[PDB]
Protein backbone atom coordinates (compact mmCIF):
# COMPACT_ATOMS: atom_id res chain seq x y z
CA UNK A 1 0.00 0.00 0.00
CA UNK A 2 2.73 2.55 0.99
CA UNK A 3 4.71 3.15 -2.23
CA UNK A 4 5.86 6.80 -1.88
CA UNK A 5 7.06 9.02 0.98
CA UNK A 6 8.25 12.60 1.50
CA UNK A 7 12.07 12.54 1.28
CA UNK A 8 14.51 14.66 3.30
CA UNK A 9 18.21 14.28 4.18
CA UNK A 10 20.04 16.92 6.28
CA UNK A 11 23.21 14.75 6.03
CA UNK A 12 22.91 14.67 2.15
CA UNK A 13 26.58 15.92 1.63
CA UNK A 14 28.37 12.94 3.29
CA UNK A 15 25.69 10.38 2.25
CA UNK A 16 25.75 11.57 -1.44
CA UNK A 17 21.94 11.74 -1.80
CA UNK A 18 19.46 14.48 -2.85
CA UNK A 19 18.39 16.86 -0.05
CA UNK A 20 14.59 16.69 -0.70
CA UNK A 21 11.83 15.27 -2.89
CA UNK A 22 9.76 12.11 -3.04
CA UNK A 23 11.18 8.67 -2.30
CA UNK A 24 9.68 5.66 -4.08
CA UNK A 25 9.73 2.76 -1.61
CA UNK A 26 11.79 -0.30 -2.58
CA UNK A 27 9.55 -3.18 -1.53
CA UNK A 28 10.65 -6.82 -1.56
CA UNK A 29 6.89 -7.54 -2.34
CA UNK A 30 6.60 -10.03 0.60
CA UNK A 31 6.74 -7.12 3.13
CA UNK A 32 4.95 -3.95 4.37
CA UNK A 33 6.41 -0.52 3.65
CA UNK A 34 6.05 2.64 5.75
CA UNK A 35 7.19 6.31 5.75
CA UNK A 36 9.21 7.91 8.54
CA UNK A 37 10.06 11.38 9.85
CA UNK A 38 13.01 12.28 12.10
CA UNK A 39 13.91 15.60 13.74
CA UNK A 40 15.48 17.46 16.67
CA UNK A 41 13.38 19.67 18.96
CA UNK A 42 15.98 21.69 20.93
CA UNK A 43 13.60 23.97 22.95
CA UNK A 44 10.57 24.44 20.64
CA UNK A 45 12.50 24.91 17.34
CA UNK A 46 12.41 21.98 14.82
CA UNK A 47 15.62 20.87 13.02
CA UNK A 48 14.59 18.18 10.47
CA UNK A 49 17.00 15.16 10.39
CA UNK A 50 15.55 12.79 7.73
CA UNK A 51 12.27 11.74 6.02
CA UNK A 52 11.82 8.67 3.76
CA UNK A 53 10.73 5.05 3.28
CA UNK A 54 10.91 2.67 6.29
CA UNK A 55 10.83 -1.19 6.05
CA UNK A 56 8.28 -3.57 7.60
CA UNK A 57 8.12 -2.48 11.25
CA UNK A 58 5.53 -3.83 13.75
CA UNK A 59 5.56 -0.42 15.53
CA UNK A 60 4.16 1.25 12.33
CA UNK A 61 1.34 -1.20 11.42
CA UNK A 62 -1.96 0.61 10.63
CA UNK A 63 -0.63 3.95 12.00
CA UNK A 64 -1.92 6.75 9.74
CA UNK A 65 -0.32 9.52 11.86
CA UNK A 66 3.46 9.86 12.23
CA UNK A 67 3.78 10.22 16.03
CA UNK A 68 7.09 9.98 17.94
CA UNK A 69 6.56 8.32 21.31
CA UNK A 70 10.17 8.00 22.71
CA UNK A 71 10.26 10.30 25.79
CA UNK A 72 12.82 13.16 25.76
CA UNK A 73 15.24 11.59 23.14
CA UNK A 74 18.10 13.39 21.37
CA UNK A 75 16.33 12.69 18.04
CA UNK A 76 12.59 12.08 17.54
CA UNK A 77 11.52 9.38 15.10
CA UNK A 78 8.07 8.35 13.92
CA UNK A 79 6.71 6.03 11.25
CA UNK A 80 3.31 5.71 9.53
CA UNK A 81 1.41 3.93 6.72
CA UNK A 82 -0.13 5.45 3.60
CA UNK A 83 1.40 7.46 0.76
CA UNK A 84 3.14 10.69 1.92
CA UNK A 85 1.84 10.09 5.54
CA UNK A 86 5.17 11.57 6.84
CA UNK A 87 4.02 14.98 5.41
CA UNK A 88 2.72 15.63 8.97
CA UNK A 89 4.58 14.66 12.14
CA UNK A 90 4.38 15.30 15.88
CA UNK A 91 5.70 13.90 19.18
CA UNK A 92 3.71 12.58 22.16
CA UNK A 93 5.14 14.20 25.37
Amino acid at each position, epitope marked *: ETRECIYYNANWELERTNQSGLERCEG*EQ*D*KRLHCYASWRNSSGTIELV*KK*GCW*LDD*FNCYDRQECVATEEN*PQ*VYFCCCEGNFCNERFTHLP
Partner: antibody
Amino acid sequence: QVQLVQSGAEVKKPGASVKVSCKASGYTFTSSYINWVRQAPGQGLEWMGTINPVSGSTSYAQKFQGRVTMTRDTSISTAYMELSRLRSDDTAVYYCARGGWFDYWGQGTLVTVS
Amino acid sequence: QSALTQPASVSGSPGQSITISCTGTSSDVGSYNYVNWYQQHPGKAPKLMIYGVSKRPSGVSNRFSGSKSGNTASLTISGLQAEDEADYYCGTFAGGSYYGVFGGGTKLTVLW
Protein backbone atom coordinates in the same frame (compact mmCIF):
# COMPACT_ATOMS: atom_id res chain seq x y z
CA GLN B 1 20.52 -9.25 -2.78
CA VAL B 2 20.28 -7.95 0.81
CA GLN B 3 23.53 -8.68 2.69
CA LEU B 4 25.04 -7.79 6.10
CA VAL B 5 28.79 -8.42 6.23
CA GLN B 6 30.60 -8.35 9.55
CA SER B 7 34.23 -7.79 10.56
CA GLY B 8 36.48 -10.79 11.24
CA ALA B 9 37.22 -12.98 14.27
CA GLU B 10 38.87 -11.12 17.17
CA VAL B 11 40.83 -12.33 20.23
CA LYS B 12 40.70 -10.23 23.41
CA LYS B 13 42.13 -10.22 26.93
CA PRO B 14 39.65 -9.97 29.87
CA GLY B 15 38.95 -6.30 30.69
CA ALA B 16 39.50 -5.13 27.10
CA SER B 17 36.90 -3.81 24.58
CA VAL B 18 35.83 -5.19 21.21
CA LYS B 19 34.17 -3.34 18.34
CA VAL B 20 32.28 -5.44 15.76
CA SER B 21 31.28 -3.86 12.46
CA CYS B 22 28.25 -4.68 10.28
CA LYS B 23 28.26 -3.49 6.64
CA ALA B 24 24.86 -3.28 4.95
CA SER B 25 24.34 -3.57 1.18
CA GLY B 26 21.54 -4.30 -1.31
CA TYR B 27 19.06 -1.98 0.52
CA THR B 28 18.86 1.54 2.04
CA PHE B 29 20.70 1.20 5.37
CA THR B 30 18.58 4.04 6.94
CA SER B 31 15.28 2.30 5.99
CA SER B 32 15.42 -0.20 8.93
CA TYR B 33 16.88 -1.04 12.33
CA ILE B 34 19.98 -3.09 13.01
CA ASN B 35 19.64 -5.71 15.77
CA TRP B 36 22.58 -7.37 17.57
CA VAL B 37 22.46 -10.91 18.97
CA ARG B 38 25.07 -13.20 20.45
CA GLN B 39 25.46 -16.93 20.85
CA ALA B 40 27.92 -18.39 23.38
CA PRO B 41 29.47 -21.86 22.46
CA GLY B 42 26.72 -24.52 22.54
CA GLN B 43 24.18 -21.97 23.88
CA GLY B 44 21.12 -20.21 22.47
CA LEU B 45 20.60 -16.86 20.78
CA GLU B 46 20.62 -13.86 23.15
CA TRP B 47 19.30 -10.44 22.09
CA MET B 48 21.79 -7.59 22.81
CA GLY B 49 19.94 -4.58 21.49
CA THR B 50 18.68 -2.51 18.59
CA ILE B 51 19.85 0.67 16.93
CA ASN B 52 17.73 3.01 14.79
CA PRO B 53 20.28 4.26 12.11
CA VAL B 54 18.11 7.31 11.25
CA SER B 55 17.92 8.73 14.82
CA GLY B 56 20.90 6.99 16.44
CA SER B 57 18.54 5.86 19.28
CA THR B 58 19.38 2.53 20.91
CA SER B 59 17.75 -0.01 23.24
CA TYR B 60 19.97 -2.45 25.07
CA ALA B 61 19.11 -5.81 26.70
CA GLN B 62 19.29 -5.58 30.53
CA LYS B 63 22.26 -8.08 30.67
CA PHE B 64 24.52 -5.61 28.70
CA GLN B 65 23.27 -2.25 30.09
CA GLY B 66 26.30 -0.23 31.10
CA ARG B 67 28.88 -2.05 28.94
CA VAL B 68 27.47 -2.10 25.36
CA THR B 69 27.54 0.80 22.90
CA MET B 70 25.80 0.64 19.51
CA THR B 71 26.61 3.29 16.92
CA ARG B 72 26.42 3.65 13.13
CA ASP B 73 28.07 5.60 10.35
CA THR B 74 25.34 6.33 7.75
CA SER B 75 27.95 7.70 5.23
CA ILE B 76 29.32 4.10 4.90
CA SER B 77 26.11 2.08 5.74
CA THR B 78 27.93 0.50 8.72
CA ALA B 79 26.58 -0.34 12.21
CA TYR B 80 28.97 -0.90 15.17
CA MET B 81 28.64 -2.85 18.43
CA GLU B 82 31.23 -2.19 21.11
CA LEU B 83 31.33 -4.42 24.20
CA SER B 84 33.51 -3.19 27.14
CA ARG B 85 35.09 -4.78 30.27
CA LEU B 86 35.26 -8.16 28.50
CA ARG B 87 34.94 -11.33 30.58
CA SER B 88 35.87 -14.95 29.72
CA ASP B 89 32.14 -15.75 29.20
CA ASP B 90 31.73 -12.99 26.52
CA THR B 91 33.39 -15.60 24.19
CA ALA B 92 30.64 -15.90 21.56
CA VAL B 93 29.64 -15.48 17.97
CA TYR B 94 28.13 -11.98 17.64
CA TYR B 95 25.56 -11.30 14.87
CA CYS B 96 23.94 -8.27 13.37
CA ALA B 97 20.51 -8.71 11.69
CA ARG B 98 18.22 -6.41 9.69
CA GLY B 99 15.11 -4.79 11.16
CA GLY B 100 12.73 -5.90 13.90
CA TRP B 101 12.02 -9.28 12.21
CA PHE B 102 15.81 -10.14 11.92
CA ASP B 103 15.01 -10.94 8.28
CA TYR B 104 18.65 -11.13 7.08
CA TRP B 105 21.59 -11.99 9.32
CA GLY B 106 25.30 -11.18 9.13
CA GLN B 107 27.68 -14.19 8.86
CA GLY B 108 28.63 -13.75 12.54
CA THR B 109 31.82 -12.67 14.29
CA LEU B 110 33.66 -14.97 16.71
CA VAL B 111 35.05 -12.98 19.67
CA THR B 112 37.25 -15.14 21.94
CA VAL B 113 38.05 -13.68 25.37
CA SER B 114 41.16 -15.45 26.73
CA GLN C 1 11.88 -9.10 28.10
CA SER C 2 9.53 -11.91 29.23
CA ALA C 3 10.92 -15.47 28.83
CA LEU C 4 9.79 -17.66 25.90
CA THR C 5 9.89 -21.37 26.52
CA GLN C 6 10.66 -24.07 23.93
CA PRO C 7 11.24 -27.87 24.42
CA ALA C 8 15.01 -28.79 24.37
CA SER C 9 14.51 -31.22 21.50
CA VAL C 10 12.10 -32.83 19.03
CA SER C 11 12.81 -35.88 16.83
CA GLY C 12 11.05 -37.04 13.72
CA SER C 13 11.15 -39.50 10.83
CA PRO C 14 11.42 -38.41 7.13
CA GLY C 15 8.02 -37.45 5.64
CA GLN C 16 6.44 -36.87 9.09
CA SER C 17 5.10 -33.58 10.46
CA ILE C 18 6.66 -31.96 13.52
CA THR C 19 5.48 -29.01 15.61
CA ILE C 20 7.86 -26.87 17.74
CA SER C 21 6.19 -24.85 20.51
CA CYS C 22 7.12 -21.41 21.91
CA THR C 23 5.24 -20.63 25.14
CA GLY C 24 4.84 -17.15 26.58
CA THR C 25 1.86 -15.59 28.38
CA SER C 26 -1.28 -13.51 27.53
CA SER C 27 0.79 -10.25 27.81
CA ASP C 28 3.25 -11.31 25.03
CA VAL C 29 2.44 -14.28 22.65
CA GLY C 30 -1.30 -14.04 23.55
CA SER C 31 -1.45 -10.29 22.71
CA TYR C 32 0.83 -9.66 19.68
CA ASN C 33 1.29 -11.29 16.23
CA TYR C 34 5.05 -10.73 16.52
CA VAL C 35 6.47 -14.28 17.07
CA ASN C 36 9.17 -15.33 14.59
CA TRP C 37 11.05 -18.56 13.84
CA TYR C 38 14.72 -19.04 12.91
CA GLN C 39 16.47 -22.08 11.54
CA GLN C 40 20.13 -22.59 12.42
CA HIS C 41 22.21 -25.32 10.78
CA PRO C 42 25.45 -26.50 12.55
CA GLY C 43 28.18 -23.87 12.11
CA LYS C 44 25.91 -21.41 10.23
CA ALA C 45 24.08 -18.12 10.88
CA PRO C 46 20.29 -18.24 11.71
CA LYS C 47 17.78 -17.85 8.86
CA LEU C 48 14.24 -16.40 9.18
CA MET C 49 11.64 -19.08 8.36
CA ILE C 50 8.38 -17.51 9.64
CA TYR C 51 7.66 -13.98 10.98
CA GLY C 52 4.59 -12.30 12.46
CA VAL C 53 3.33 -15.72 13.76
CA SER C 54 2.30 -17.09 10.33
CA LYS C 55 3.95 -15.07 7.52
CA ARG C 56 6.42 -16.93 5.28
CA PRO C 57 9.17 -14.93 3.46
CA SER C 58 9.67 -15.72 -0.25
CA GLY C 59 12.41 -18.32 -0.69
CA VAL C 60 11.25 -20.32 2.38
CA SER C 61 9.79 -23.80 1.66
CA ASN C 62 5.95 -24.03 1.91
CA ARG C 63 6.55 -27.10 4.22
CA PHE C 64 7.11 -24.46 6.99
CA SER C 65 4.02 -22.87 8.51
CA GLY C 66 3.35 -20.95 11.74
CA SER C 67 0.33 -20.58 14.02
CA LYS C 68 -0.77 -19.46 17.51
CA SER C 69 -3.25 -20.84 20.08
CA GLY C 70 -3.59 -19.09 23.41
CA ASN C 71 -0.11 -18.22 24.69
CA THR C 72 1.73 -20.75 22.53
CA ALA C 73 3.11 -20.01 19.04
CA SER C 74 3.92 -23.05 16.93
CA LEU C 75 6.22 -23.81 14.03
CA THR C 76 5.06 -26.78 11.92
CA ILE C 77 7.35 -28.62 9.50
CA SER C 78 5.45 -30.87 7.01
CA GLY C 79 7.11 -33.66 4.97
CA LEU C 80 10.25 -33.76 7.18
CA GLN C 81 13.49 -33.89 5.15
CA ALA C 82 17.19 -34.42 6.13
CA GLU C 83 17.99 -30.67 5.58
CA ASP C 84 15.42 -29.68 8.29
CA GLU C 85 17.85 -31.04 10.95
CA ALA C 86 18.88 -27.88 12.84
CA ASP C 87 18.24 -25.77 15.91
CA TYR C 88 15.03 -23.71 15.80
CA TYR C 89 14.53 -20.52 17.79
CA CYS C 90 11.39 -18.57 18.33
CA GLY C 91 11.76 -14.85 19.05
CA THR C 92 9.75 -11.64 19.20
CA PHE C 93 9.96 -8.44 17.16
CA ALA C 94 12.82 -6.20 18.39
CA GLY C 95 12.92 -2.43 17.88
CA GLY C 96 11.16 0.80 18.82
CA SER C 97 8.79 -0.03 21.71
CA TYR C 98 9.59 -3.80 21.52
CA TYR C 99 12.37 -5.41 23.59
CA GLY C 100 13.87 -8.49 21.87
CA VAL C 101 13.74 -12.00 23.33
CA PHE C 102 14.55 -15.42 21.92
CA GLY C 103 13.30 -18.77 23.18
CA GLY C 104 15.96 -21.21 24.45
CA GLY C 105 15.86 -23.04 21.11
CA THR C 106 14.88 -26.55 20.02
CA LYS C 107 17.23 -29.11 18.52
CA LEU C 108 15.37 -30.96 15.74
CA THR C 109 16.77 -34.40 14.82
CA VAL C 110 15.66 -36.22 11.62
CA LEU C 111 16.17 -39.93 12.18
CA TRP C 112 17.15 -41.71 8.94
